[PDB]
Amino acid sequence: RPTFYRQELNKTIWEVPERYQNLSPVGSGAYGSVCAAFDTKTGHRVAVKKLSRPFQSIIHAKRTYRELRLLKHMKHENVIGLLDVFTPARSLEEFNDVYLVTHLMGADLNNIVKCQKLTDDHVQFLIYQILRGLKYIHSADIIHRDLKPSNLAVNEDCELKILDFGLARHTDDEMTGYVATRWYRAPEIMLNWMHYNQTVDIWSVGCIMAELLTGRTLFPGTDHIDQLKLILRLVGTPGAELLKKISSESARNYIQSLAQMPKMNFANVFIGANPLAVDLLEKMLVLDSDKRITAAQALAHAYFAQYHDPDDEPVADPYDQSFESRDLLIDEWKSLTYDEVISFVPPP
Ligand SMILES: Clc1ncnc2ccsc12
Ligand SMILES: [Cl-]
Ligand SMILES: [Cl-]
Ligand SMILES: [Cl-]
Ligand SMILES: [Cl-]
Ligand SMILES: [Cl-]
Ligand SMILES: [Mg+2]
Incomplete structure (x- = not known):
């Protein structure tokens, strides 16, 4: 587990791993509550999203799970990918907050x-x-x-x-x-x-x-x-x-x-x-x-004709979306989401 530090970002408390430095708000809120930071592990400028009220209803808990599943799957040069996902929680019992990290788009x-x-x-x-x-x-x-x-x-x-x-x-x-x-x-x-x-x-x-x-x-x-x-x-x-x-x-x-x-x-x-x-x-x-x-x-x-290369136009691994037709309780969607946070493996 990394060490986390806390800071207030415009009336919101952010708790993030020490690797992320120089946090400052960015965007018009189109993709949620997002800050710009410098990632010291990779040397990239990144976007850190803190989800608002991720488990407040069945509809919101299922939407949180859906967003994390889709972002973990997408591994392609022309699609947004997930650089990291974290929670300061040390157990399912104290899990409340989810943070998503992507490349900062200019x-x-x-x-x-x-x-x-x-x-x-x-x-x-x-x-x-x-x-x-x-x-x-x-x-x-x-x-x-x-x-x-x-x-x-x-x-x-x-x-x-x-x-x-x-x-x-x-x-x-x-x-x-x-x-x-x-x-x-x-x-x-x-x-x-x-x-x-x-x-x-x-x-x-x-x-x-x-x-x-x-x-x-x-x-x-x-x-x-x-x-x-x-x-x-x-x-x-x-x-x-x-x-x-x-x-x-x-x-x-x-x-x-x-x-x-x-x-x-x-x-x-x-x-x-x-x-x-x-x-x-x-x-x-x-x-x-x-x-x-x-x-x-x-x-x-x-x-x-000048760009087409049929040996460099790859397809995706299979994506299981059977959860979309599943009826679960808030705490069951929250447990599924917690497992996907702790199982994340970062890109090469
Ligand atoms: Cl593009 C997109 N779709 C869903 N969530 C996020 C978080 C950062 S970028 C992004
Ligand atoms: Cl760290
Ligand atoms: Cl547009
Ligand atoms: Cl990307
Ligand atoms: Cl938490
Ligand atoms: Cl799958
Ligand atoms: Mg849209």
């Missing part, structure tokens, strides 16, 4: 899209890295569900990592009105059309790729219905085949109230873009999720 994609001039070469390398990380995530039967520029960390060398695993499901209020939290969402999940699957993430990558090419949000809707109208004007209204797959009768009735529209010519929308970029966007932004390109298929597209 800038996200929004900063570079907003403030930098990007070459077709920059767009190739950024989207190649997102798809490489997604091929890995999807091989474990994990759906990200929230890919957007603020969840993509980017460094000076244009190297990228994917963020946001096992945090609270987004509320209907967070999704209301003129908000970036909805602009990257696939239509079948935005409007609850049907049981969704991993194909939702490829819609999101299409929306991100279009914005890197134009410097503008692709579907900046003022509300759910305005955003659906922007989507159908580009990709066309649904045919009988997709309408059959909308399980919700009222959602089917609403769609049929709209005048039919054809798919637009993407070369006249993305004026001057690399024809290979236009071709890939047409294969991602397909209304029927069964027909969209997969991450593994997209890596082999000619747009990525």
Whole structure:
């Protein structure tokens, strides 16, 4: 067991191993209560997250367990990983607090899209890295569900990592009105059309790729219905085949109230873009999720010929998510979480 020391960080008591020094608050609270520190064992600048009220309800205890399981699994160059997890508790009986340690992220994609001039070469390398990380995530039967520029960390060398695993499901209020939290969402999940699957993430990558090419949000809707109208004007209204797959009768009735529209010519929308970029966007932004390109298929597209290496695009170890359908008490979720804290092995 390391030695711990205590300090008050803006009306919060932090108790952490001596290896972590020079703690100071960071971020806009998007990933929880997070400080920056220097890790003296590894020489890296790190983010230390202290969870708020991790065991206060069954819902919160299960969310804590879910976040720790997901972060312990993810071992890939293009995905956030866990550097450490600790508790000052010396037994299950005194366990209350959980702390997670990751690499400190400086800038996200929004900063570079907003403030930098990007070459077709920059767009190739950024989207190649997102798809490489997604091929890995999807091989474990994990759906990200929230890919957007603020969840993509980017460094000076244009190297990228994917963020946001096992945090609270987004509320209907967070999704209301003129908000970036909805602009990257696939239509079948935005409007609850049907049981969704991993194909939702490829819609999101299409929306991100279009914005890197134009410097503008692709579907900046003022509300759910305005955003659906922007989507159908580009990709066309649904045919009988997709309408059959909308399980919700009222959602089917609403769609049929709209005048039919054809798919637009993407070369006249993305004026001057690399024809290979236009071709890939047409294969991602397909209304029927069964027909969209997969991450593994997209890596082999000619747009990525300069970066694609099929011997260096790895898949994940198997991920057991059977706990997700399990009904347990608060103390049972707390015991499962304690075992995952004490069994952690740090990366090489
Ligand atoms: Cl990205 C992400 N998802 C869930 N928890 C954390 C803690 C630090 S970064 C992070
Ligand atoms: Cl230490
Ligand atoms: Cl990492
Ligand atoms: Cl504790
Ligand atoms: Cl964003
Ligand atoms: Cl597993
Ligand atoms: Mg999110």
